[PDB]
Swiss-Prot record:
Disruption phenotype: Inactivation of Trpm7 in mice results in early embryonic death (6.5-7.5 days). Mice die as a result of trophoblast defects and consequent failure of implantation. Tissue-specific null mutants shown defects in cardiac and renal morphogenesis, organismal Zn(2+), Mg(2+), and Ca(2+) homeostasis and thrombopoiesis. Bifunctional protein that combines an ion channel with an intrinsic kinase domain, enabling it to modulate cellular functions either by conducting ions through the pore or by phosphorylating downstream proteins via its kinase domain. The channel is highly permeable to divalent cations, specifically calcium (Ca2+), magnesium (Mg2+) and zinc (Zn2+) and mediates their influx. It is found in: Cell membrane; Cytoplasmic vesicle membrane. Found to be expressed in brain and skeletal muscle, with stronger signals in kidney, heart, liver and spleen. In the C-terminal section; belongs to the protein kinase superfamily. Alpha-type protein kinase family. ALPK subfamily. In the N-terminal section; belongs to the transient receptor (TC 1.A.4) family. LTrpC subfamily. TRPM7 sub-subfamily. Homodimer. Homotetramer. Forms heteromers with TRPM6; heteromeric channels are functionally different from the homomeric channels. Interacts with PLCB1. Autophosphorylated; autophosphorylation regulates TRPM7 kinase activity towards its substrates. This is Transient receptor potential cation channel subfamily M member 7. It comes from the Eukaryota.
Length: 184
């Protein structure tokens, strides 16, 4: 969990460590903390750098998720997508956060019995375990969302490698228009 994700990132009223406290290891405010070791360790790093995520590592936490997901991107209708990574005990990678400086959102806010909590709220796709980079972000293309929205999620990210392999699969059945709109 928290000790494993911090060792991954290290290997690659206000307080500052050198009641909300920033840091200056889980640098709260990236990680807003509230073989297989380096694959699950170095996989979510390449999944969190290329999208600019908030790794989370309980009521304030779930309120922060259900209010973080109701946010809007720049030109995109959808909300910030939340993934539960319960492989290491519950880290919850939020895929495209708003790069905040240290918080008004937070003002406005075993584990196998916590898997089932997520699957009754909207979706909250849970990945529990191929590369951990593309599985963690490609877990969001498994709900009932439209193929166009699966493209715009990849387009808010910088990730072409998902969009070729998992959004332009043969037999995708695109709409006759609106691929023109993602072109816009």
């Amino acid at each position: 969990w928290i000790e494993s994700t911090l060792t991954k990132r290290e290997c690659v009223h206000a307080c500052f460590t050198a009641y909300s406290d920033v840091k200056l290891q889980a640098i709260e405010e990236d990680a807003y903390g509230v073989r297989i070791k380096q694959l699950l360790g170095k996989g979510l790093i390449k999944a969190a750098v290329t999208t600019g995520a908030w790794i989370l590592t309980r009521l304030r936490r779930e309120l922060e998720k259900t209010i973080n997901q109701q946010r809007i991107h720049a030109r995109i209708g959808q909300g910030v997508p939340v993934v539960a990574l319960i492989f290491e005990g519950g880290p919850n990678v939020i895929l495209t956060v708003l790069e905040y400086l240290q918080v008004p959102v937070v003002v406005c806010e075993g584990q196998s019995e916590a898997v089932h909590l997520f699957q009754t709220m909207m979706e909250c796709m849970k990945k529990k375990e191929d590369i951990d980079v593309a599985i963690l972000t490609a877990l969001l293309k498994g709900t009932n969302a439209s193929a166009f929205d699966q493209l715009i999620l990849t387009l808010a990210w910088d990730r072409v490698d998902i969009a070729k392999n998992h959004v332009f699969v043969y037999g995708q059945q695109w709409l006759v228009g609106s691929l023109e709109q993602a072109m816009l």
